[PDB]
Amino acid sequence: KVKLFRASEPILSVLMWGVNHTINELSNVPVPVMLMPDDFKAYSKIKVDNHLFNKENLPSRFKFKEYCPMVFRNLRERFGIDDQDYQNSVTRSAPINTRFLTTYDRRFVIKTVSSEDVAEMHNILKKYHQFIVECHGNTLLPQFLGMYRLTVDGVETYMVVTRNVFSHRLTVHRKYDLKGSTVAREASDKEKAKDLPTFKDNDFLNEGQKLHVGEESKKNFLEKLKRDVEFLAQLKIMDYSLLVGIHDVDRAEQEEMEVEERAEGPGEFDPSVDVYAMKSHESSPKKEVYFMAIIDILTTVNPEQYSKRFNEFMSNILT
Amino acid sequence: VKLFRASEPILSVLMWGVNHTINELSNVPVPVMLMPDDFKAYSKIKVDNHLFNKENLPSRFKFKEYCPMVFRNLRERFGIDDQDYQNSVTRSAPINRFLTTYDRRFVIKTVSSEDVAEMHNILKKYHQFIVECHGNTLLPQFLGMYRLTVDGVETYMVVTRNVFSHRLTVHRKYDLKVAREASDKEKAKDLPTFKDNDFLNQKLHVGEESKKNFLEKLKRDVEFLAQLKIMDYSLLVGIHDVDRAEQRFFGPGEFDPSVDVYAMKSHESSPKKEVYFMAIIDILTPEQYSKRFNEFMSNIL
Numbered sequence: 117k118v119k120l121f122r123a124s125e126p127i128l129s130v131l132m133w134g135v136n137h138t139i140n141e142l143s144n145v146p147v148p149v150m151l152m153p154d155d156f157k158a159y160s161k162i163k164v165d166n167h168l169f170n171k172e173n174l175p176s177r178f179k180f181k182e183y184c185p186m187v188f189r190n191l192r193e194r195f196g197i198d199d200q201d202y203q204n205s206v207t208r209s210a211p212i213n214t215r216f217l218t219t220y221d222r223r224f225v226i227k228t229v230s231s232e233d234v235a236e237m238h239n240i241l242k243k244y245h246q247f248i249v250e251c252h253g254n255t256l257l258p259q260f261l262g263m264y265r266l267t268v269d270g271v272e273t274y275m276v277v278t279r280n281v282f283s284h285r286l287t288v289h290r291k292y293d294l295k296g297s298t299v300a301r302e303a304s305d306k307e308k309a310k311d312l313p314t315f316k317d318n319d320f321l322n323e324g325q326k327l328h329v330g331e332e333s334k335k336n337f338l339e340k341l342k343r344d345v346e347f348l349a350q351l352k353i354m355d356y357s358l359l360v361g362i363h364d365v366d367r368a369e370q371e372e373m374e375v376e377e378r379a380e381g382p383g384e385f386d387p388s389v390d391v392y393a394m395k396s397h398e399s400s401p402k403k404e405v406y407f408m409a410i411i412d413i414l415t416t417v418n419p420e421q422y423s424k425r426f427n428e429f430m431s432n433i434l435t
Numbered sequence: 436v437k438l439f440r441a442s443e444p445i446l447s448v449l450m451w452g453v454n455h456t457i458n459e460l461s462n463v464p465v466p467v468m469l470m471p472d473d474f475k476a477y478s479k480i481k482v483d484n485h486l487f488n489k490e491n492l493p494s495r496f497k498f499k500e501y502c503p504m505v506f507r508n509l510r511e512r513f514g515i516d517d518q519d520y521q522n523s524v525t526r527s528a529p530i531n532r533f534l535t536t537y538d539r540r541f542v543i544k545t546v547s548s549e550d551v552a553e554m555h556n557i558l559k560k561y562h563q564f565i566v567e568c569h570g571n572t573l574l575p576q577f578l579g580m581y582r583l584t585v586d587g588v589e590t591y592m593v594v595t596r597n598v599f600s601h602r603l604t605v606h607r608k609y610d611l612k613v614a615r616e617a618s619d620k621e622k623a624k625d626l627p628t629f630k631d632n633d634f635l636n637q638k639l640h641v642g643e644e645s646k647k648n649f650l651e652k653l654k655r656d657v658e659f660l661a662q663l664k665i666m667d668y669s670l671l672v673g674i675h676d677v678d679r680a681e682q683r684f685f686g687p688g689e690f691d692p693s694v695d696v697y698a699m700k701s702h703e704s705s706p707k708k709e710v711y712f713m714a715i716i717d718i719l720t721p722e723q724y725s726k727r728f729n730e731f732m733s734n735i736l
């Protein structure tokens with residue numbers, strides 16, 4: 117049952133160590149009836165200075181800092197995530213990939229951020245938590261599960277953990293980053309020649325792509341979108357995108373059969389897990405699954421105007 | 436949930452620290468052998484919490500464990516499971532600097548910085564002695580050694596196995612090592628610590644059988660100690676009186692010899708039915724004291 121924290125780079129193993137440590141300590145801390153103001157200004161810090169001990173995978177010397185752990189544990193709770201599960205998917209095997217990682221099981225995403233981002237998080241955290249609670253966790257917004265600072269070789273590195281917009285099991289065959297903004301966003305020649313290019317607004321437009329999801333899902337989604345984007349506007353926030361992943365069910369059935377031949381449900385998902393996933397309309401051309409969420413909310417137009425244009429472009433995304 | 440509630444914050448840090456280091460060790464593989472770096476090694480962690488988890492721990496403190504691999508191995512060679520050790524330190528606060536765990540299994544002794552230096556000077560030879568005697572000794576069993584920093588002051592502690600039983604009440608105590616005895620001011624205490632001249636003037640008979648094993652062990656121990664130029668140590672004797680204890684259920688004079696490692700049953704030819712505990716203590720602060728000590732303690736049984 118041991119945990120070597122073996123990882124490709126020393127700061128990944130420090131990440132694993134720190135998530136493991138803080139989740140254990142938290143397991144020793146009772147679960148409060150309510151959050152109090154200073155939970156939003158709180159942190160935990162540890163400094164480790166080992167010597168000739170346990171240095172197969174961890175560095176002898178490192179620091180780990182968790183921000184407002186009572187508040188992020190609460191957020192995890194409101195997002196339907198068990199702390200044991202979170203810990204396990206960070207620490208049971210190395211995350212794989214400023215920098216962008218995924219837990220080995222693709223449940224969670226770990227993004228390196230800047231000092232300034234950490235500041236943005238602190239000043240919006242109370243209002244964001246209040247938002248999450250009055251919308252019961254039903255939001256296209258990023259679900260923030262934890263925020264850390266690692267110190268390795270005297271270098272500080274800030275990280276935010278977030279739920280994967282995409283499914284942990286269904287393959288993403290196409291993806292767009294949409295802002296709806298006035299001036300042209302097409303994907304690059306370098307990006308378009310990549311394996312899974314992140315396409316942009318005008319790519320989506322000039323592909324003629326529509327997204328048929330049918331009425332009840334369309335309404336749920338658009339209502340989430342209105343509430344979220346007005347929340348962001350009132351926080352005076354701009355330049356966020358909607359991330360759109362497309363999964364082709366037929367294509368994945370063929371991919372799976374090809375790997376299973378080389379060994380010599382289908383297009384169905386757990387909405388409790390793949391929380392941004394929607395199946396295509398019962399009368400849709402190709403059986404598809406989409407994943408749509410807002411991203412990059414940390415860091416001509418004003419934020420109210422950003423809200424308006426974003427909501428219009430995303431509502432016309434889908435029939 | 437393991438709230439580290441304790442009389443002093445230093446005991447809260449000790450509980451937190453043992454918990455933390457044993458859990459971390461459960462993630463460190465048991466090596467095929469100890470290596471020389473293990474005898475020069477330590478772990479250190481500094482905690483700085485701001486408005487978080489302040490309910491029983493200090494927000495700021497430090498914890499250092501000397502030579503964790505060596506002491507985990509000694510724990511194994513003394514037949515002590517790490518989870519059990521952890522449980523005896525962490526599950527409830529130790530109690531009365533000299534403490535025992537709440538279950539009285541282990542003693543926690545506050546210790547000088549020079550003692551820590553003497554421990555690092557004797558530890559490697561002491562480990563190989565524990566090896567060569569397959570862990571049956573009367574020497575103190577060192578289970579772990581820690582430096583705690585709370586409120587800016589350092590505090591060094593050694594954890595050792597209790598000489599007395601963790602269940603059976605001990606009635607008479609003797610600290611036997613120039614004549615010394617107990618003092619009228621110490622005499623007005625609950626369980627007196629009596630010395631060797633008080634004893635000589637607590638009549639111990641264990642039979643012809645156990646005496647042989649016991650004194651083979653003692654001679655081996657104090658020969659090694661003399662070879663270490665260690666002197667001025669004690670043999671600690673405790674006497675539990677069954678009939679007095681009388682005046683589902685454990686039995687009177689009932690003990691687990693795997694737990695109460697030093698216990699020793701009465702002989703028949705003994706005026707009262709007792710159980711006695713014996714072990715060498717206080718070896719951290721010459722040959723003449725090897726010979727005189729051996730002679731005395733054997734003519735005590």
Ligand SMILES: Nc1ncnc2c1ncn2[C@@H]1O[C@H](COP(=O)(O)OP(=O)(O)NP(=O)(O)O)[C@@H](O)[C@H]1O
Nearest residue numbers: 156157158230231232233234235236238239265272
């Ligand atoms: N070189 C350093 N060594 C030690 N601590 C440091 C160092 N640099 C920064 N810190 C601390 O680490 C914090 C984290 O960085 P920062 O991104 O500014 O957080 P913050 O937004 O100012 N926190 P908050 O006031 O709750 O919003 C800094 O504010 C300092 O408290």
